Write an enzyme that holds these catalytic residues in place. Structure first.
Site, short mmCIF file in Angstrom:
data_model
loop_
_atom_site.label_atom_id
_atom_site.label_comp_id
_atom_site.label_asym_id
_atom_site.label_seq_id
_atom_site.Cartn_x
_atom_site.Cartn_y
_atom_site.Cartn_z
CB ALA B 20 -0.92 0.00 1.20
CE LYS B 44 -1.26 7.06 0.91
NZ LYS B 44 0.43 6.99 1.40
CG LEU B 72 -3.01 8.79 5.15
CD1 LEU B 72 -2.48 7.31 4.77
CD2 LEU B 72 -3.15 8.78 6.78
CG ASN B 128 -1.98 1.99 7.65
OD1 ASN B 128 -1.28 1.15 8.72
ND2 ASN B 128 -1.62 2.75 6.93
CB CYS B 131 -2.38 4.52 11.27
SG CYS B 131 -3.57 5.92 10.79
CB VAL B 194 6.44 -5.03 9.12
CG1 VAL B 194 6.41 -6.14 10.05
CG2 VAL B 194 7.56 -4.69 8.15
C1 LIG Z 1 5.99 6.17 -0.53
C2 LIG Z 1 5.39 5.25 0.44
C3 LIG Z 1 4.00 5.23 0.77
C4 LIG Z 1 3.59 4.52 1.68
N1 LIG Z 1 2.02 4.62 2.11
C5 LIG Z 1 1.50 3.55 2.71
C6 LIG Z 1 0.38 3.64 2.82
O1 LIG Z 1 -0.52 4.47 2.40
N2 LIG Z 1 -0.19 2.45 3.68
C7 LIG Z 1 0.35 1.73 4.27
O2 LIG Z 1 -0.07 0.70 4.91
N3 LIG Z 1 1.83 1.42 4.01
C8 LIG Z 1 2.21 2.35 3.15
N4 LIG Z 1 3.78 2.47 3.03
C9 LIG Z 1 4.43 1.07 3.78
C10 LIG Z 1 4.54 0.27 2.44
O3 LIG Z 1 3.42 -0.55 2.28
C11 LIG Z 1 5.50 -0.96 2.99
O4 LIG Z 1 4.83 -1.49 4.34
C12 LIG Z 1 6.59 -0.51 3.48
O5 LIG Z 1 7.36 0.32 2.59
C13 LIG Z 1 7.76 -1.54 3.59
O6 LIG Z 1 7.96 -2.44 2.44
P1 LIG Z 1 9.11 -2.35 1.28
O7 LIG Z 1 10.26 -2.72 2.41
O8 LIG Z 1 8.70 -3.25 0.22
O9 LIG Z 1 9.26 -0.94 1.13
C14 LIG Z 1 4.30 3.24 2.19
C15 LIG Z 1 5.74 3.05 1.53
C16 LIG Z 1 6.21 4.03 0.80
C17 LIG Z 1 7.73 3.82 0.40
O1 LIG Z 2 1.48 8.13 4.17
C1 LIG Z 2 2.41 7.87 4.92
O2 LIG Z 2 3.36 8.63 5.30
C2 LIG Z 2 2.52 6.29 5.21
N1 LIG Z 2 3.80 5.93 4.88
C3 LIG Z 2 4.26 4.61 5.41
O3 LIG Z 2 5.31 4.03 5.27
N2 LIG Z 2 3.32 3.81 6.03
C4 LIG Z 2 2.04 4.40 6.26
O4 LIG Z 2 1.31 3.64 6.84
C5 LIG Z 2 1.70 5.58 5.83
C6 LIG Z 2 0.42 6.20 6.04
C7 LIG Z 2 0.07 6.41 7.68
C8 LIG Z 2 0.82 7.44 8.14
C9 LIG Z 2 0.31 8.89 7.98
C10 LIG Z 2 1.29 9.67 8.41
C11 LIG Z 2 2.49 9.72 8.90
C12 LIG Z 2 3.43 10.90 9.29
F1 LIG Z 2 2.79 11.74 9.34
F2 LIG Z 2 4.16 10.65 10.29
F3 LIG Z 2 4.41 11.19 7.86
C13 LIG Z 2 2.97 8.27 8.95
C14 LIG Z 2 2.23 7.15 8.69
#
Ligand SMILES: Cc1cc2nc3c(=O)[nH]c(=O)nc-3n(C[C@H](O)[C@H](O)[C@H](O)COP(=O)(O)O)c2cc1C
Ligand SMILES: O=C(O)c1[nH]c(=O)[nH]c(=O)c1CCc1ccc(C(F)(F)F)cc1
Ligand SMILES: Cc1cc2nc3c(=O)[nH]c(=O)nc-3n(C[C@H](O)[C@H](O)[C@H](O)COP(=O)(O)O)c2cc1C
Ligand SMILES: O=C(O)c1[nH]c(=O)[nH]c(=O)c1CCc1ccc(C(F)(F)F)cc1
Lengths: 313, 313
Positions: B20, B44, B72, B128, B131, B194
């Protein structure tokens, strides 16, 4: 140009030392670290009684770092105290003694005996808060009420400046809580950030097996895996504990890595996995590398850049 | 040999999907992920209202992984619900919709409106928990009481099988508690381990600066840094939650990495940082690589090895 500095009423040739647990368990290991170019040394975290530790294999290393579940193998407090009191050559460099008793009571008992040696010889205490807690509870530093007890009890029993070895934290509220706990204790004069990143799992694809025997393969991670975690903890505590020193540990393999720890706020820089892998020669390399980065940048002192990491807008 | 899975009353051509947040915010993104050879896709994490997110730069990537503080940014729930109900081609692959409300009430409101679409079209909910809740408190899944409240409220509001996205844990007592909370909720049918490793800090040596603007440079880590943490979590929940599926996320760059996830217990395997860096072509490569390792080992199906990591003695 030289890297010497003064902290905690001691003089150090350079900011480098071993990380607790690496190259510091036996008399031979301590003599080897004393003979190295490191600025200081720390002894293996100890218990009141000797421990054999966990079954082998219990440490393994890989290109990106290491995993361990040593189980606190150590020669016992009496040994480390004798080393501090009778064997260590303080003319060569400072000594830190690390304690990690199985209870608060054990720690108190050990620190009451260390205090006169600290007074007479100048050995410095590093209290390892990655230590056993009461049933159902996480490690002590992850249970803030336990942490506050341990520190209150040690502070009363010891009565002298000391430091604490911290596990990493991953949440800003946790940084705020933990730093507030620490800042209740004026005798806590340095915070070492960080211990291994807990309960990772390395699996070998060929054998389809975990690579250490204790805990079904789970163990603490060190090395390149953990540098950004280490830097964040260093900086978080540097920001929150202005009247304390922060010592950095985690992911140092080069002078650049040391430079980044110092920029985040580190006073001393500890080396674990890379020292275990490369041996004590690493200290000359690190010093040379750090001086070379300083020279390219025009820095003459560590104080010119310690804690001076820049933020964006 | 085949990579097919049938789970949650869906059929998947292979276990791979985006993580995600990556390649899943806009309709263009979701059409791209649909056209790719991944087995599924996830949208997302969304909020009730659209969000611009944090100021840029807010994501950076490097050889060993990535750091992000995106905040987010998303098109709002109503967009992702429309995509689910009217736009997505379910003949191509299954869709997960991730939600990340800023309060329990906000989540309840969204899942109430998602339910009928889930029941009619078969979209799957990923809640999620890694958060924000009240600022100054830990993230929801680091606050076990809050986590239980969220799960009770969403289970009552939604009334259909769903899954949850978890942050990593680092302490065995936490694995135990967290799993025990999840096991109170029979509608939680999958656990994705994770999310990013929280609040790391990348510093660039040349510029002496942090690399992302929000939160003084602190952000969540992904990629090669986090693979052993990810594996540990997958396996810890796999062992503790025998009536649930575990989906693996973290550090996947290759079929070998994916094979380790699967050995640890993973059903689906999600790709974040590596997908962000390589693009959707990564899915064909991961499929090929995983099939090659299966062929060398004589494995015909994923069930032959899922959760079959060996321990030592
Ligand atoms: C740019 C970015 C945006 C993310 N946004 C979300 C999110 O909206 N919801 C969420 O559950 N995880 C979010 N994550 C976390 C990823 O889903 C994932 O759990 C984390 O990046 C670890 O996996 P990886 O090692 O393949 O990057 C985000 C990660 C990145 C890099
Ligand atoms: O939207 C993101 O920043 C995000 N990034 C991730 O690596 N995992 C997540 O689950 C999310 C969404 C949840 C969330 C929202 C806000 C923050 C921040 F304000 F600290 F940037 C972090 C995580
Ligand atoms: C084999 C081994 C044993 C260790 N034993 C201890 C110890 O007794 N006390 C302690 O405070 N930390 C101990 N640690 C943690 C290290 O001091 C250090 O915090 C961690 O390895 C991260 O630094 P690194 O990335 O340089 O390895 C041990 C680490 C290793 C690899
Ligand atoms: O010896 C270890 O496994 C070890 N490894 C690390 O990466 N960090 C450490 O801090 C440790 C020691 C942790 C510890 C402390 C105290 C006990 C005891 F009280 F039971 F002896 C056990 C383990």
């Amino acid at each position: 140009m030289c890297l010497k500095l003064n902290l905690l009423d001691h003089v150090f040739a350079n900011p480098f030392m071993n990380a607790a647990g690496v190259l510091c368990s036996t008399e031979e290991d301590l003599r080897c670290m004393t003979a190295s170019s490191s600025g200081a040394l720390v002894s293996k975290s100890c218990t009141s009684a000797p421990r054999d530790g966990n079954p082998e294999p219990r440490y393994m290393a890989f290109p990106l770092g290491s995993i361990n579940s040593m189980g606190l193998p150590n020669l016992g407090f009496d040994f480390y105290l004798k080393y501090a009191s009778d064997l260590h050559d303080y003319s060569k460099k400072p000594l830190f003694l690390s304690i990690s008793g199985l209870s608060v009571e054990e720690n108190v008992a050990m620190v009451r005996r260390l205090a006169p040696v600290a007074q007479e010889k100048g050995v410095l205490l590093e209290l390892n808060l990655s230590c056993p807690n009461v049933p159902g509870k996480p490690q002590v530093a992850y249970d803030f009420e336990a942490m506050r007890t341990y520190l209150q009890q040690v502070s009363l029993a010891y009565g002298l400046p000391f430091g604490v070895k911290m596990p990493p934290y991953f949440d800003i509220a946790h940084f705020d809580t933990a730093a507030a706990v620490l800042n209740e204790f004026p005798l806590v004069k340095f915070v070492t950030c960080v211990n291994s990143v807990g309960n990772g799992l390395v699996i070998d694809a060929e054998s389809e097996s975990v690579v250490i025997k204790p805990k079904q393969g789970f163990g603490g991670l060190g090395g390149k895996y953990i540098l950004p975690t280490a830097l964040a903890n260093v900086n978080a505590f540097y920001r929150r504990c202005p009247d304390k020193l922060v010592f950095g540990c985690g992911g140092v393999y080069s002078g650049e890595d040391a430079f980044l720890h110092i920029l985040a706020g580190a006073s001393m820089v500890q080396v674990g996995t890379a020292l275990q892998e490369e041996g004590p020669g690493i200290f000359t390399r690190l010093e040379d590398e750090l001086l070379e980065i300083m020279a390219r940048k025009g820095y003459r002192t560590l104080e010119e850049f310690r804690g001076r990491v820049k933020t964006i807008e």
